[PDB]
Structure formats: structure tokens, C-alpha cells
Amino acid sequence: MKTSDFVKYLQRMIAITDTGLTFTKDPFDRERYEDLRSLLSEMLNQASDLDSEEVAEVLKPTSAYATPLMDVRAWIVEDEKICLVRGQGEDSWALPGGFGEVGYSPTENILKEIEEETGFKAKVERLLAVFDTNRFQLQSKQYTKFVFGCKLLDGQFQENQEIADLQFFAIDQLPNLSEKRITKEQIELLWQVYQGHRGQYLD
Amino acid sequence: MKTSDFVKYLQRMIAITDTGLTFTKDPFDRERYEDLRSLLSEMLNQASDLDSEEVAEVLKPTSAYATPLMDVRAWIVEDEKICLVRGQGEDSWALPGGFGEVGYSPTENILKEIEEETGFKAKVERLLAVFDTNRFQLQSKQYTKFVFGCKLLDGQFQENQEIADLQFFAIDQLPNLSEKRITKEQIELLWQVYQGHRGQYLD
């Protein structure tokens, strides 16, 4: 593909993205258009010919099948209490995290989720568990739920469009849990792994 | 622009656009994402030598939720040699495994694939690594590649419709690898984790 054809596609996509940035009324759509606009701008700066044979060989294999969905969670313990967050408009609590996003590794995914939800930079210590939601919180979609032990670094919690509150809870004083995201049984297993009283948990 | 960066940009923009289609509640935002997906499809056609079937395979929506996909692999060592399999119609070798199927847990998935491919029942001993395919073997889809250390139990290898051959190889006498499934660098890393020279590998 020639540079001029690449520029054509990029400019057409930028037009649509800019329209989204002007007209959308939804903050989560706005975030997506901001992400797209940033990527497209970088791409335009880098516009060049592309080796279409090389592109095809990097893309292969092209066939893909549905798998369980990636979910990432952070296990953060301070003063023997666990960090839980409560979503906007929700009355239940869960470990920070959410869907794994394409374009980020497993550890980068949890760090991205921690920063966006909690307002803190963080470090990943270890993977504590890989849970199957079919075992612990059966739902219409199946997830592979990675739970990483993490430490918070610099930052500050700020209520935002995703998260209404962030608090630390003793395991014998847990609040109402969002079961589809984390259960008391999972928290108890995680505490055992965290304290080195059993090995990494795998479903 | 580098080929690898083009593929990562495309992969990411497909994921964002698909997330917009699933989550937006406004018909004009829906149309914007649809128009973006049409442009991504046109750009991919022009940027790559993929045939029409292959292009459709890349663009076929795999899921309503765009996340990295599951791939599972088995690390089986006997007499200090590593089990590799060669698929029917293929000249190269990989660790047993494949994509994670919905309806099975991560360990159940690897045990199922070990039995189907190698003819053996097995035990999962530990998780050795979770690799990001975007790092080690970039391809159209991003996978979280779980590599489980496993021990074979009862059974027998028989050539079947999926697998042409199964052999054990010394760490320093590896055959030609199916790199989109496993690389020499990954095998070397895995050997170090397996031998306890370093901890679990996580991207």
C-alpha cells in the first residue's frame, strides 16, 4: 500500500472520530474516540508505504475462535484489610479490575485498570489465582479471572464515571459483594494464597 | 511505519470499535463505529496480501467483548526432553495445546487438549508462564498463552486427524518450531522456570 492510500484511510477515520468527539453525549464513547484519535494521529505521523506481503505474514493465522473472556482483578492488602471499589450507581463492592483489553499484556491490563479506577500507580507482585467464573459465579458469559497481588504507589482516589468509592475492609467485615465479580469464597482462598498457606490457585 | 506497529494499531482499533458497538446507546455513535469498522476493513484489504477468505477470517467478529483470547499449552518433560507435536499438514512443531474452549476451566482445557492430541491422560502440576503473543509471536489476534507444567499418565500416542507425530526433544536439539504457537525463546524461558532457576513468567 502506498503512503497516499494510507493517508486517505487515516483521514477518513479521523473525520468520523472527530465527529464523535464533537457530538457524543456519553463519557465512555468520548473516551473511546479520544483513544482512537490519539492512535490515528500517531499513525498519520508515521504514514508510509506498507509491505503488504509482510503485513499478511504477521497477521496469520487469520482464523480465530471464541474463548472465555479475560477479566483482571487486583488484590491489594493494607493494614490487613483488602481494597474494594464500588461502581457508580451500584450498591456492591469488588476487587478493582475489569475486562482485559486488547493491546495490553496481562500485567499492563491490571495496572491500567488500577490507575483508571483507583487513581493510583501500582506494581504487580505476583499472580495469586486464575479463577473460572463457571465454578464460582456462573453467568451467561465465561471469564478467565486473573487475580494479581498488587501494591499501590503514588496517587489519590477520585470519584469518577466508573467508580463511586474505594475503601479497605477486614475479611471478617466484608461489605455487600458484587458476586459476579468476586465472591467471599474467592476472597478467602486469595487470603490463603497471599499469606503463603497454599499455592497459586488454578481452576 | 513498521509492519509490526501497523498490525498492533489495526488490532487495537478493531477492539475499540467493537467495544463501541457493544456498549454505545446512541444510534449516531453506533453508525460512527460501523463506519470506522468499514474503513478498517477497506484498509486491511489494501494493506495486506490476504485472500478474500483470510481477510473475512480477520474481520469476522469473534465475540461481543473484545479481550485477549485464551491459548493453552502443555510443558511435559521426560528424561530431560520436551514433548512436541506436529500437526497434520504441517512441517513444524509446538507444545501440545490450542485455544481455550468455552465450557471448560483453564486446567480442564489443557488436559482435554493433551488427551486429544497426545493420546494420554495427564496431571497439571503448575502454571509456568502466561505469555503475551503480541510480544513473542505477533499475529492478528492477541492471546494470553498459558503454559502449564504437566505430567503424562496412562495412554498411548496414535496419529490422528489433528496430529501427525509426537516426539521428545532435548532443550539444545529443538526442531523447526511453529512460531505462532511457541518460539525457541519461550521454550528456553520455560526450561529455566521448570528447573526452578527463576519464578513464574508473566507478561
Residue numbers in the entry:
A (entry chain B), B (entry chain A): 1 to 203
What does the paper behind this entry write?
The Streptococcus pneumoniae gene SP_1669 encodes a Nudix hydrolase. The gene is located in an operon containing MurF, suggesting that it plays a role in the Mur pathway of peptidoglycan biosynthesis by hydrolyzing Mur pathway substrates. This enzyme contains a modified Nudix signature sequence, GX5YX7KEUXEEXGU, in which a conserved glutamate/arginine pair that forms a hydrogen bond in the canonical motif is substituted by a tyrosine/lysine pair (position 7 and 13 of the signature sequence). The enzyme robustly hydrolyzes these compounds, indicating that it is a UDP-X diphosphatase (UDP-Xase) that hydrolyzes substrates of the form of UDP linked to some moiety X (UDP-X). The UDP-Xase from Streptococcus pneumoniae, may be a member of a novel Nudix hydrolase family whose members fold as asymmetric homodimers and act on bacterial cell wall precursors as well as RNA.
